[PDB]
C-alpha cells in the first residue's frame, strides 16, 4: 500500500539505501553493478513498486520483488553462467524483517558472520522462528519459541527456569539485536529463559559453535532475538487473549512517523499477562514495555535510542522440580500433575531492562558503519521455599528448604563494526571488521541462616503450599563478580568463482573475571572461522565449515592441584547441502555435524573419594567429549497458501568415559508445524496444526534411602498442536489455539536434584487481535 517518498538523484548505491529506508524494505544489490550509475528523482506518496521502477529509470536494472525484500540486478546481453552467491550489499544490517512476510522461513540473516546473507549463503546450521509462526502458534515467550524450534529440546529446572539443548549442550549464549549478553551463570542471566515475544520480530538460532560473534560462550548454539523496529507508515494492533487456568494476556503495538516528514519515527509496545497454571498454587504476572525512536540526522546517518523492560513476577515458585522422586523410604512417588512443591509465598521474580543507542552511517563508498551502546540490567528477588528431600515420610510429613537470593547485574557494552565490498582479482568480495567491549557487574545478597523457623509440614499428599514464611535473618553472603570481555573480529567473504564462496575470519578475545574469586584471565585467545559454499545448480549448494568457541570455566572448576581447568572449548565440523526453491520462498537443508569438546569439567571420582590436598575439597578433571549427528530441515511455502517449518535432528554425545552424556536430551527428535490459508469462499480462514516427537530419554539418579543408582526413562512421545484463525473483518480477527491435543502426560525434568517436572497438559488459548 501507498508510501511517502523523497529520494533525489544520487549514486544508485545511496539511492538504494535511501529507498530501503523510506520503504521499510530490504534492498539487496550488487555493488559492482550499480557503481557508475544514478537514480532518477522520486517524489511523494507512491506505491513502493511504482516508486522503485521510477527510481531505477535509466539505470538498466530490474527488480525481483521478494516479500519484505527486493533484489536489484542489471542483466547484460553477455552472462557466461550465473553467480548465485554474488556479493550483495544490503540496506538493513540485521537482515529481512519477517513481520508481514506471511512466511515461516526467514529472508536474510546476519547471525553467522555479521554479513547480510541468505540461509543458502550461510555455511552454518541456521534456524529461524519467524514473526508469523509466532503469531499463528501463540508463542508468546522464548520458552514457547524454543519448544517449537527445530533441533531444540526444552527441559525444566523449575517453574521459572527452563533449559535449552542443542547438539549435546546447554545453550547459554543469547543476543539482542546481535549484541551478546553475559550469561556465565544464573546471576548474570536473570530472565533469559522468560523474554516476552511482544517486542521481537523474530528469533534466530545459530547451532554449532558460535564463537565468531558470541565471543566466549557455550557449545550448541546462540539464540539471537531481533527487536521490532518503527516504520514510515503509521500502524498498530491491540490483542486480547484468554487460556486454560485463568491465563489472560493483552498486548498493544504502535509504530510510525512522529513528524510531518518522517525523519523521526517511533515504535512502542506494552504487553501484560497474569496467569495461573495447571500446577497447584502457582501464578505469574509478566509486564513488558518497549520504546524505540529513530532519528535521521541526514539521509545517510541514523540515530536510534530505545528502552525495554520486562518483569517476571511469580508466586509458588519452586527451587528444583515439581516434586521429589523418592519418598522417605525410597519408593518412587506418584502425584497428580497439579502437584507443586513450592510454597505459596515462594517466588523467583526476575527482571530485565535495557537502554540502548546506536548510530549507523553509510559511507558513500558502499561501506556502512555502526556503533552500538548498551546498558542492561538483569535482576532477581528470589525468596524460594519448596519441599525438598526424600519425602513424604511414612506419617505423611515433609520438610521445606527455604533460601533467599536477591541481586542485580548491570552490563555496559560498546560494539563497533565496518562492512563493505572490495575488488580483488577482478571479482567482488566483502568484509566485516569490528571490535567489542562489555563490562558487567553482578552484586547480590544471599540468605540461608534462618532464625527460628520450623520447616516441617504435616500433610504431603495434600500439600497446598500453605506453610509459614521464615525469618531470613541477616545476609549470609555478598556477591561481587565483574566480567570484562574485549573482542575484535574479521570475516572476509571471497567470491572465488561463480560457484564458490570462501569464508575466512576469526575473533581475538580477552576475558577477565574479577571479584570474590581468584581472577580468571584469558588474553589474546584466537577463534578461527573457515567456511565454504559450492553451488551445484540453480537449486542446491553444498557447504562445509570449521567453527570454534570457548568459555573460561566457573571458578569452582579446579583440579587436584587447586588449579582452574583450562577453558571449556569446542570445534564444530559441519558439512551439508542446502536447497533453495521458489525464489527463496522455500528453504531446505540436510546437515552432518560433529562437535569436538575439550576441557569439559568432570567430577574426579578417585580424588573426591577422599580429598588429600587440603587446599581443594572437591576437584574436577578436564576431559574431552564428542557429538556426532545430523539434521534435516524445511521452511516456507509448500504451496500457495501453505506454509511449514520442520526438522529432524539425530545426536549422540559421548565423553571420555566412553559413556553417553546429555542422556536427557533425546537422541532423535522431529518437529513439523504448518498452517494453510484457504482460497475463495473461505479465504478469511487459516487452519494449522503441528506435531513434535522425541525418542527415549533417561537420567541416572541416586536413590539415597536404598543406596542404589536407578535409571529413569521418558519413553518416546508425541505432542500435537492445532490452530485456527478467522479474519472476520479488515481490522479484526479471532484465533483459537489448542495445545497438546491428546493430553499426553509426560516429563520435562527427571533427576535435577532428585526431583521431577511434568510438561503442560492440554491447554487452550483464545484471542482477538485488532489492527488499526
Ligand atoms: C533515555 C531513555 C530512552 C527512552 C526511549 C523511549 C521511546 C518512547 O517513544 C515512544 C514512541 O512511539 C511512537 C508511537 O508511534 C505512533 C505514531 O502515531 C502518532 C499519531 O498519529 C497521528 C495520526 O496518524
Ligand atoms: C481437559 C480440558 C481440555 C478441553 C478440550 C477442548 C477442545 C475443543 O475445542 C473447541 C473450541 O471451539 C470453540 C469455538 O469458540 C470460538 C472462538 O471464538 C473467539 C471469540 O472471539 C471474540 C470476538 O470479540
Amino acid at each position: 500500500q501507498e508510501v511517502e517518498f523523497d529520494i533525489p538523484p544520487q549514486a544508485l548505491g545511496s539511492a538504494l539505501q535511501e529507498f530501503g529506508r523510506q520503504a521499510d524494505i530490504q534492498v539487496l544489490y550488487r555493488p559492482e553493478e550499480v557503481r557508475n550509475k544514478r537514480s532518477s528523482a522520486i517524489k511523494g506518496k507512491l506505491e513502493p513498486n511504482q516508486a522503485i521502477t521510477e527510481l531505477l529509470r535509466g539505470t538498466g536494472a530490474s527488480v525481483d520483488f521478494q516479500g519484505n525484500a527486493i533484489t536489484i540486478s542489471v542483466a547484460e546481453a553477455a552472462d557466461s553462467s550465473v553467480d548465485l552467491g554474488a556479493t550483495m550489499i544490503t540496506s538493513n544490517q540485521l537482515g529481512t524483517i519477517t513481520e508481514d512476510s506471511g512466511s515461516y522461513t526467514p529472508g536474510t540473516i546476519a547471525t553467522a558472520t555479521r554479513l547480510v546473507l541468505t540461509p543458502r549463503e550461510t555455511p552454518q546450521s541456521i534456524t529461524v522462528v519467524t514473526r508469523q509462526n509466532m503469531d499463528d502458534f501463540g508463542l508468546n515467550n522464548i520458552d514457547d519459541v524454543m519448544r517449537h524450534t527445530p533441533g531444540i529440546t526444552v527441559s525444566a529446572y523449575d517453574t521459572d527456569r527452563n533449559n535449552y539443548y542443542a547438539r549435546g549442550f546447554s545453550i547459554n549464549n543469547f543476543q539482542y539485536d546481535g549484541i551478546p549478553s553475559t550469561a556465565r551463570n544464573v546471576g548474570y542471566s536473570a530472565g533469559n529463559t522468560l523474554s516476552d515475544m511482544a517486542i521481537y520480530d523474530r528469533v534466530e538460532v545459530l547451532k554449532g559453535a558460535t564463537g565468531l560473534l558470541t565471543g566466549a560462550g557455550s557449545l550448541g548454539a546462540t539464540i539471537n532475538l531481533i527487536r521490532k523496529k518503527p516504520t514510515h507508515e503509521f500502524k498498530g494492533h491491540v490483542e486480547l487473549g484468554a487460556g486454560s487456568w485463568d491465563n489472560y494476556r493483552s498486548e498493544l503495538d504502535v509504530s510510525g512517523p512522529l513528524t510531518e516528514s518522517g525523519n523521526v519515527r517511533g515504535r512502542a509496545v506494552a504487553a501484560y499477562q497474569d496467569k495461573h497454571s495447571f500446577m497447584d498454587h502457582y501464578e505469574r504476572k509478566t509486564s513488558v514495555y518497549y520504546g524505540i525512536l529513530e532519528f535521521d540526522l541526514n539521509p545517510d546517518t541514523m540515530l536510534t535510542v530505545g528502552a525495554d523492560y520486562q518483569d517476571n513476577d511469580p508466586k509458588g515458585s519452586g527451587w528444583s522440580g515439581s516434586f521429589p522422586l523418592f519418598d522417605s523410604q525410597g519408593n518412587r512417588n506418584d502425584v497428580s500433575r497439579s502437584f507443586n512443591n513450592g510454597a505459596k509465598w515462594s517466588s523467583w521474580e526476575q527482571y530485565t531492562r535495557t537502554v540502548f543507542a546506536n548510530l549507523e552511517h553509510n559511507f558513500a563508498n558502499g561501506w556502512v558503519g555502526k556503533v552500538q551502546l548498551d546498558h542492561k540490567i538483569n535482576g532477581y528477588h528470589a525468596p524460594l521455599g519448596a519441599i525438598m528431600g526424600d519425602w513424604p515420610a511414612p506419617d505423611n510429613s515433609a520438610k521445606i528448604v527455604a533460601q533467599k537470593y536477591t541481586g542485580e547485574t548491570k552490563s555496559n557494552s560498546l560494539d563497533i563494526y565496518l562492512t563493505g565490498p572490495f575488488q580483488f582479482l577482478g571479482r567482488e568480495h566483502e568484509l566485516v571488521v569490528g571490535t567489542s567491549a562489555s563490562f558487567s557487574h553482578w552484586e547480590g545478597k544471599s540468605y540461608w541462616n534462618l532464625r527460628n523457623y520450623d520447616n516441617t509440614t504435616d500433610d504431603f499428599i495434600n500439600w497446598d503450599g500453605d506453610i509459614g514464611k521464615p525469618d531470613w535473618g541477616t545476609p549470609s553472603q555478598y556477591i561481587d563478580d565483574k566480567t570484562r570481555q574485549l573482542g575484535s573480529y574479521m570475516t572476509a567473504r571471497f567470491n572465488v568463482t561463480d560457484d564458490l564462496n570462501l569464508f575466512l575470519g576469526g575473533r581475538v578475545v580477552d576475558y577477565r573475571v574479577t571479584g570474590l574469586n581468584p581472577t580468571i584471565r584469558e588474553s589474546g585467545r584466537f577463534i578461527p572461522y573457515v567456511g565454504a559454499v559450492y553451488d551445484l545448480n540453480d537449486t542446491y549448494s553444498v557447504y562445509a565449515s570449521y567453527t570454534d568457541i570457548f568459555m573460561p570455566q566457573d571458578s569452582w572448576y579446579r583440579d587436584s592441584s587447586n588449579k582452574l581447568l583450562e577453558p571449556d572449548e569446542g570445534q564444530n565440523y559441519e558439512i551439508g547441502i542446502k536447497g533453495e526453491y521458489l525464489d527463496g520462498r522455500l528453504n531446505t537443508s540436510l546437515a552432518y555435524f560433529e562437535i569436538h569438546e575439550e576441557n569439559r569439567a568432570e567430577e574426579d571420582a578417585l580424588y573426591n573419594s577422599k580429598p588429600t590436598n587440603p587446599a581443594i575439597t572437591y576437584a574436577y578433571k578436564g576431559i574431552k567429549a564428542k557429538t556426532k549427528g545430523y539434521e534435516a530441515e524445511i521452511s516456507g511455502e509448500l504451496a500457495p497458501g501453505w506454509q511449514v517449518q520442520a526438522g529432524y535432528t539425530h545426536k549422540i554425545i559421548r565423553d571420555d568415559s566412553g559413556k553417553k552424556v546429555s542422556t536427557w536430551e533425546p537422541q532423535d527428535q522431529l518437529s513439523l508445524y504448518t498452517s494453510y490459508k484457504f482460497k475463495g469462499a473461505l479465504d478469511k480462514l487459516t487452519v494449522g496444526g503441528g506435531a513434535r516427537w522425541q525418542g527415549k530419554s533417561w537420567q541416572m539418579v541416586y536413590n539415597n534411602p536404598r543406596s542404589r543408582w536407578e535409571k529413569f526413562s521418558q519413553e518416546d512421545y508425541w505432542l500435537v498442536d492445532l490452530m485456527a484463525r478467522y479474519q472476520i473483518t479488515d481490522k479484526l480477527s479471532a484465533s483459537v489455539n489448542v495445545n497438546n491435543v491428546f493430553d499426553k502426560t509426560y516429563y520435562t525434568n527427571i533427576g535435577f536434584y532428585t526431583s521431577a517436572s511434568y510438561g503442560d497438559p492440554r491447554n487452550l488459548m483464545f484471542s482477538t487481535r485488532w489492527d488499526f
Side-chain angles (χ1 to χ4, degrees):
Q1 322 174 269
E2 230 165 70
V3 179
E4 201 102 348
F5 290 93
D6 162 28
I7 299 131
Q10 46 189 288
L12 187 50
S14 302
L16 281 173
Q17 231 95 5
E18 213 148 317
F19 190 85
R21 258 193 221 141
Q22 274 153 54
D24 316 310
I25 247 166
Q26 201 186 29
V27 186
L28 334 176
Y29 61 87
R30 303 168 65 159
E32 88 290 4
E33 285 196 1
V34 302
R35 170 166 33 232
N36 24 30
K37 281 173 200 285
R38 293 163 103 256
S39 42
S40 9
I42 32 140
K43 195 60 208 213
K45 226 179 269 185
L46 288 165
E47 260 194 8
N49 59 315
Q50 262 161 326
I52 185 68
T53 73
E54 224 155 315
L55 193 154
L56 296 165
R57 176 190 153 252
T59 69
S62 321
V63 173
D64 183 355
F65 300 83
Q66 31 193 225
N68 305 335
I70 74 195
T71 128
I72 273 75
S73 47
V74 177
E76 319 305 323
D79 286 328
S80 100
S81 91
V82 64
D83 196 344
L84 278 177
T87 297
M88 278 191 98
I89 282 334
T90 277
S91 75
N92 181 320
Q93 298 298 101
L94 277 158
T96 325
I97 295 169
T98 73
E99 132 170 304
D100 302 320
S101 75
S103 183
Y104 289 1
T105 202
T108 54
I109 262 338
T111 324
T113 65
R114 216 78 138 205
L115 302 165
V116 187
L117 299 163
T118 58
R120 181 193 201 162
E121 289 173 320
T122 298
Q124 265 159 284
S125 275
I126 172 64
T127 294
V128 156
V129 184
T130 60
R131 176 66 265 167
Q132 183 69 47
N133 198 313
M134 264 157 30
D135 287 24
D136 287 341
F137 298 84
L139 311 181
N140 302 128
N141 64 9
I142 183 86
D143 271 348
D144 301 333
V145 179
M146 293 300 93
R147 282 185 275 248
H148 286 32
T149 315
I152 294 285
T153 321
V154 178
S155 57
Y157 285 127
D158 55 52
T159 47
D160 299 278
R161 245 271 162 150
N162 289 143
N163 180 68
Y164 310 145
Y165 306 104
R167 297 182 172 201
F169 298 95
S170 273
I171 302 138
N172 260 85
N173 311 335
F174 294 81
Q175 294 164 177
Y176 307 81
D177 285 325
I179 302 307
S181 69
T182 309
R184 260 191 93 71
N185 54 60
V186 294
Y188 293 96
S189 220
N192 291 5
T193 156
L194 287 163
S195 318
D196 202 274
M197 286 300 108
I199 76 182
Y200 299 105
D201 179 75
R202 95 176 90 103
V203 3
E204 58 204 40
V205 2
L206 189 63
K207 321 211 216 72
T210 56
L212 172 67
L213 311 178
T214 300
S218 35
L219 294 167
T222 311
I223 288 160
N224 169 33
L225 290 88
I226 307 308
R227 264 186 281 247
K228 293 175 164 181
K229 263 163 68 80
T231 49
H232 289 84
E233 42 144 54
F234 160 88
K235 66 169 207 203
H237 58 270
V238 177
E239 213 154 347
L240 284 178
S244 309
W245 319 296
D246 322 297
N247 185 340
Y248 297 95
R249 147 175 271 264
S250 54
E251 173 197 298
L252 160 47
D253 172 350
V254 237
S255 198
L258 278 174
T259 69
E260 21 174 332
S261 35
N263 64 317
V264 8
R265 268 161 265 139
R267 184 165 184 177
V269 17
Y272 174 69
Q273 173 156 19
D274 173 346
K275 64 153 144 176
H276 289 200
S277 163
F278 68 93
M279 285 184 68
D280 193 280
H281 66 269
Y282 177 85
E283 55 146 312
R284 183 153 79 268
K285 298 181 176 72
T286 94
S287 300
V288 1
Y289 315 98
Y290 178 44
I292 183 165
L293 297 156
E294 279 163 342
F295 305 82
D296 298 343
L297 311 165
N298 56 72
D300 52 73
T301 307
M302 185 180 59
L303 171 67
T304 307
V305 331
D308 68 39
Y309 173 90
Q310 178 163 344
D311 173 0
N312 301 275
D313 191 12
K315 254 29 212 173
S317 286
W319 205 107
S320 71
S322 311
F323 58 96
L325 292 179
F326 315 98
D327 66 8
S328 67
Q329 33 202 229
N331 311 312
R332 275 116 186 257
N333 275 297
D334 187 30
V335 275
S336 269
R337 292 184 293 172
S338 51
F339 203 89
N340 174 27
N341 65 356
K344 274 180 150 59
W345 48 263
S346 174
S347 172
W348 182 354
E349 97 84 53
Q350 304 161 46
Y351 74 87
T352 49
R353 94 189 174 236
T354 316
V355 186
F356 64 89
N358 331 124
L359 190 48
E360 176 181 351
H361 179 80
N362 302 340
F363 296 84
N365 252 164
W367 279 69
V368 32
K370 189 153 156 213
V371 171
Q372 293 173 252
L373 265 176
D374 259 73
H375 187 71
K376 184 177 226 217
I377 291 146
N378 283 67
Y380 54 94
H381 174 83
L384 302 174
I387 298 174
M388 164 169 335
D390 303 316
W391 304 112
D395 70 351
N396 206 249
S397 73
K399 280 194 198 173
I400 308 333
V401 164
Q403 288 155 23
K404 182 156 176 171
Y405 302 90
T406 81
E408 183 164 3
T409 305
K410 325 199 170 156
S411 317
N412 285 127
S413 314
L414 174 62
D415 215 288
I416 117 126
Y417 75 90
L418 247 128
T419 210
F422 73 95
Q423 272 230 90
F424 192 23
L425 284 150
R427 346 185 87 262
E428 280 279 303
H429 324 290
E430 59 169 346
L431 190 63
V432 228
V433 65
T435 192
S436 76
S438 61
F439 302 83
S440 62
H441 184 188
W442 179 24
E443 287 168 46
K445 290 181 199 192
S446 325
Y447 291 77
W448 54 71
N449 300 310
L450 323 186
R451 304 295 341 263
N452 289 85
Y453 187 52
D454 164 24
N455 73 321
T456 90
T457 184
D458 45 293
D459 203 324
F460 174 93
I461 250 132
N462 298 133
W463 174 244
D464 196 9
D466 182 7
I467 196 180
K469 175 153 80 181
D471 161 15
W472 302 104
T474 50
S476 301
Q477 176 170 253
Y478 301 68
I479 317 276
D480 201 63
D481 225 44
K482 292 179 163 223
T483 292
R484 190 256 272 165
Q485 231 242 248
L486 301 181
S488 327
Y489 54 81
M490 184 162 340
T491 317
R493 180 177 181 267
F494 286 109
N495 190 246
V496 194
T497 70
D498 297 306
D499 340 320
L500 176 41
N501 297 279
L502 188 54
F503 275 89
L504 285 179
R507 181 187 192 97
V508 31
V509 167
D510 166 304
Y511 197 89
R512 154 175 271 202
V513 34
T514 254
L516 297 204
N517 308 318
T519 291
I520 295 139
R521 229 294 164 83
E522 294 291 340
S523 270
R525 276 258 175 157
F526 180 71
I527 295 177
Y529 186 94
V530 182
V533 154
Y534 191 68
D535 308 341
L536 285 183
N537 32 275
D538 269 7
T539 286
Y540 294 100
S541 296
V542 308
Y543 75 88
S545 62
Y546 161 74
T547 56
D548 187 73
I549 218 205
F550 77 90
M551 173 55 86
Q553 222 105 193
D554 293 316
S555 152
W556 48 97
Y557 288 147
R558 333 191 111 259
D559 64 19
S560 269
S561 279
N562 208 5
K563 275 171 207 140
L564 188 77
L565 291 185
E566 230 115 75
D568 201 329
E569 205 177 338
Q571 305 63 60
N572 184 110
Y573 295 91
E574 178 151 354
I575 213 219
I577 181 176
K578 273 164 155 183
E580 188 177 86
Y581 322 77
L582 298 155
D583 199 12
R585 262 135 50 224
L586 177 77
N587 284 103
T588 55
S589 48
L590 168 57
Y592 181 78
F593 64 82
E594 216 160 283
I595 278 176
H596 298 199
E597 180 171 22
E598 42 270 355
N599 301 307
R600 147 186 277 247
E602 228 261 283
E603 207 222 322
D604 202 342
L606 276 183
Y607 185 76
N608 302 333
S609 248
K610 174 91 92 63
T612 289
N613 186 350
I616 344 88
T617 210
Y618 197 83
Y620 298 82
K621 202 159 64 111
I623 59 170
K624 297 192 142 179
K626 200 187 275 150
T627 289
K628 285 155 151 181
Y630 59 85
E631 196 170 46
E633 313 195 9
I634 185 176
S635 54
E637 181 177 357
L638 293 174
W642 190 10
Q643 280 272 327
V644 286
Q645 165 162 67
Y648 179 108
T649 306
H650 165 80
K651 80 63 149 84
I652 291 153
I653 175 157
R654 314 195 124 102
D655 76 17
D656 270 354
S657 75
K659 78 183 204 251
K660 292 181 169 169
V661 120
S662 307
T663 80
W664 187 244
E665 168 185 35
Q667 301 215 176
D668 289 287
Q669 60 169 304
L670 139 62
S671 256
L672 171 149
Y673 283 108
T674 202
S675 62
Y676 184 53
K677 250 281 274 279
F678 286 106
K679 198 86 224 350
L682 20 205
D683 66 34
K684 282 162 128 319
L685 170 74
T686 315
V687 143
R692 167 30 191 253
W693 176 85
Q694 57 178 69
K696 284 74 146 153
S697 41
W698 67 99
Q699 275 294 1
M700 291 303 285
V701 25
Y702 191 72
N703 181 326
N704 187 9
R706 267 171 189 267
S707 279
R708 51 178 200 219
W709 284 90
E710 315 197 346
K711 154 186 276 192
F712 272 77
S713 295
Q714 174 63 46
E715 266 255 33
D716 68 309
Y717 62 100
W718 290 93
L719 286 183
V720 175
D721 287 336
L722 292 171
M723 171 288 155
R725 173 180 58 250
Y726 189 87
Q727 189 68 48
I728 324 167
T729 281
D730 268 4
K731 304 220 307 289
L732 193 144
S733 63
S735 318
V736 55
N737 298 64
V738 192
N739 287 303
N740 181 18
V741 156
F742 294 107
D743 190 22
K744 180 94 194 163
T745 131
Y746 69 110
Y747 292 103
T748 51
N749 144 53
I750 313 188
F752 180 77
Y753 283 81
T754 318
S755 79
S757 285
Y758 283 124
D760 283 316
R762 217 200 259 106
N763 55 97
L764 291 88
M765 181 79 189
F766 286 93
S767 14
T768 16
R769 174 202 170 118
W770 161 30
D771 308 72
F772 328 122

